[PDB]
Amino acid sequence: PPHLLFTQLSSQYGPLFGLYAGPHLTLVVSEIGLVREVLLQRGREFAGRPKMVTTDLLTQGGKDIAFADYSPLWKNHRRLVHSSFTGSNKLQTIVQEAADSLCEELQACRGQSSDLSVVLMRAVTNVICRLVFSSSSDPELQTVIQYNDGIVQTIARLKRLKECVSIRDQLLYKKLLEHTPGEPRDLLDALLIGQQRGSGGADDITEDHVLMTAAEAFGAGVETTSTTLLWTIAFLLHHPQLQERVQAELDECVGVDRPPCLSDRPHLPLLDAVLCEVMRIRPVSPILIPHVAMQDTSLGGHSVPKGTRVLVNMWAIHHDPKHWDQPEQFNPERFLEPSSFLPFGAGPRVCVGESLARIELFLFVSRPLQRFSFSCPSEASLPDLQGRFGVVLQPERYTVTVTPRH
């Protein structure tokens, strides 16, 4: 796989490669210094994204955030979303009530070598359809899960894809249509408020961008977080001792009861370190979304023509033995104290869900670990740590035994 291939080649040929496709050049960047040039130092010049056709379909031809070109239209559009992610004092609430749902379904499978994934998909999807449309067991969804899995699978291996996006677009359009500038209840509310306001176009966002942003916040919110929960628990199975310590940390500073609040984070540094280790050892995107050069620029000491694509090899920088000790190995300790670590990227294209992901990961990893304990079953393996990329780096299915405290 690309991220392993260019990681291996970096030791002996440079940390910087070039590939040619048509008449457009692609640089691969696999050294911390050079990625900070791309993402920080000269962040703005590399802030373009490419116009593929699969992404077009996904986002109605660059009407989202992640696959849209940097532009005044994009900067105001991002501002709106950012504001918005920020209150959400909210959740907490939203998260904790889904964590209770999740957590109360897990005990219903006590001593069951369940296969936790359907359960986590439903949990995170609740948090998200909720935080975006205030939507809610059930369901139409299968439908959501059904259309999400259809899109992911189509891309994993169209034709089949359009129809799947079309399902999502109509469904979302209905909730967009149905959707108080004082006290917003939804991320979609916030987006319509800001769209309302702007006299733009030309530069203010059409509402389509709302539909697309709402559609993207799903994809991103569910697929990144699901995976990070699946990875987290996978690792805590190969390392039971560490599972105990985090539980011991949780015991000592939160009760055996108090739903861990967001105000407990400074007091729970080993847990935060575990989330940061999970982020490090399995990048959700071992290669970022291509950054495109918005003008003639440079990198290393070399001119980079405008239109050049730049793949950031985040696996390489997070596994670089020059900046990490035994990066293959799993130590949240390596973060125990208070160069190369950018789990959400950096600069103008940094993750927009970073605030949310930190908060959302904390609140129901603390809680599953507060009420439950996760073990490799007797007649199963340990989970396979290699994992598979598309559309994020996720682990293969694994089976896990849950048992509560008492």
Q: Could you list the residues that contact ligand HEM (CB under 6 A)?
A: 39, 65-66, 216-217, 220-221, 224-225, 228, 279, 284-285, 288-289, 343-345, 349-353, 356-357
- The residue among 350 and 380 lying less far from ligand HEM, judged by its C-beta, is 350
258 is in an annotated binding site: no
- The residue among 250 and 356 lying less far from ligand AER, judged by its C-beta, is 356
Rule CB under 5 A: is residue 253 a binding residue for Hg ion? yes
Report, in Å, the least distance between residue 311 CB and ligand AER: 14
- The residue among 246 and 284 lying less far from ligand AER, judged by its C-beta, is 284
Of ligand AER, ligand HEM, Hg ion, none, which one sits near residue 188, judging by CB under 5 to 8 A according to partner kind?
Answer: none
Phi/psi of residue 291, nearest 5 degrees: -95, 135
351 is in an annotated binding site: yes
Query: Which one of 64-72, 73-81, 265-273, 311-319 is the stretch in contact with Hg ion (CB under 5 A)?
Result: 265-273
Number of residues that bind Hg ion (CB under 5 A): 8
Query: Which one of 117-125, 136-144, 218-226, 292-300 is the stretch in contact with ligand AER (CB under 6 A)?
Result: 218-226
Q: How far is Cα 7 from Cα 97, in angstroms, rounded to an integer? A: 42
Report, in Å, the least distance between residue 147 CB and ligand AER: 7
For the chain, state the CA radius of gyration.
Answer: 21
Residue window 127-156: x/- pattern of binding to Hg ion, with contact defined by CB under 5 A? --------------------x--x------
- The residue among 104 and 163 lying less far from Hg ion, judged by its C-beta, is 163
Q: Burial, 34: exposed, middle or buried (Cβ in 10 Å; 0-12, 13-18, 19+)?
A: buried
The residue number whose beta carbon is nearest to ligand HEM equals 353
Report, in Å, the least distance between residue 144 CB and Hg ion: 11
Phi/psi of residue 114, nearest 5 degrees: -65, -175
Closest of 248, 249, 314 to residue 286, by C-alpha: 314
> DSSP secondary structure string, 69-105?
PPSHHHHHHHHHHHHHH---TTTTHHHHHHHHHHHHH
Report, in Å, the least distance between residue 267 CB and Hg ion: 4
Rule CB under 6 A: is residue 223 a binding residue for ligand AER? yes
Closest of 318, 217, 219, 225 to residue 277, by C-alpha: 318
Q: How far is Cα 364 from Cα 142, in angstroms, rounded to an integer? A: 23
Q: How far is Cα 113 from Cα 317, in angstroms, rounded to an integer? A: 36
276 is in an annotated binding site: no
Rule CB under 5 A: is residue 236 a binding residue for Hg ion? no
Q: How far is Cα 79 from Cα 335, in angstroms, rounded to an integer? A: 31
Exposure string over 323-337, b if 16+ CB within 10 A, otherwise e? ebeebeebbbebbee
Rule CB under 6 A: is residue 151 a binding residue for ligand AER? yes
Of Hg ion, ligand AER, ligand HEM, none, which one sits near residue 350, judging by CB under 5 to 8 A according to partner kind?
Answer: ligand HEM
- Asked if residue 350 lies in contact with residue 65, where contact means CB atoms within 8 angstroms, the answer is no
354-371 vs 269-281: helix crossing angle, rounded to 10: 120
Query: For ligand AER, which residue of 26, 41, 71, 285 counts as binding (CB under 6 A)?
Result: 285
253 is in an annotated binding site: no
Three-class secondary structure of residue 268 per DSSP? coil
Q: How far is Cα 305 from Cα 207, in angstroms, rounded to an integer? A: 34
- Quote the tokens at residue 250: 């949780």
- The residue among 4 and 382 lying less far from Hg ion, judged by its C-beta, is 382
- The residue among 355 and 375 lying less far from ligand HEM, judged by its C-beta, is 355
- Asked if residue 91 lies in contact with residue 186, where contact means CB atoms within 8 angstroms, the answer is no
Of ligand AER, ligand HEM, Hg ion, none, which one sits near residue 370, judging by CB under 5 to 8 A according to partner kind?
Answer: none
- The residue among 237 and 392 lying less far from ligand HEM, judged by its C-beta, is 392
H/E run at residue 55: helix 54-59
Footprint of ligand AER (CB under 6 A): 58, 66, 148, 151-152, 216, 219-220, 223-224, 284-285, 351, 391-392
Annotated binding site for heme: 351
Footprint of Hg ion (CB under 5 A): 147, 150, 164, 253, 264, 267, 376, 382
Annotated binding site: 49, 291, 349, 351
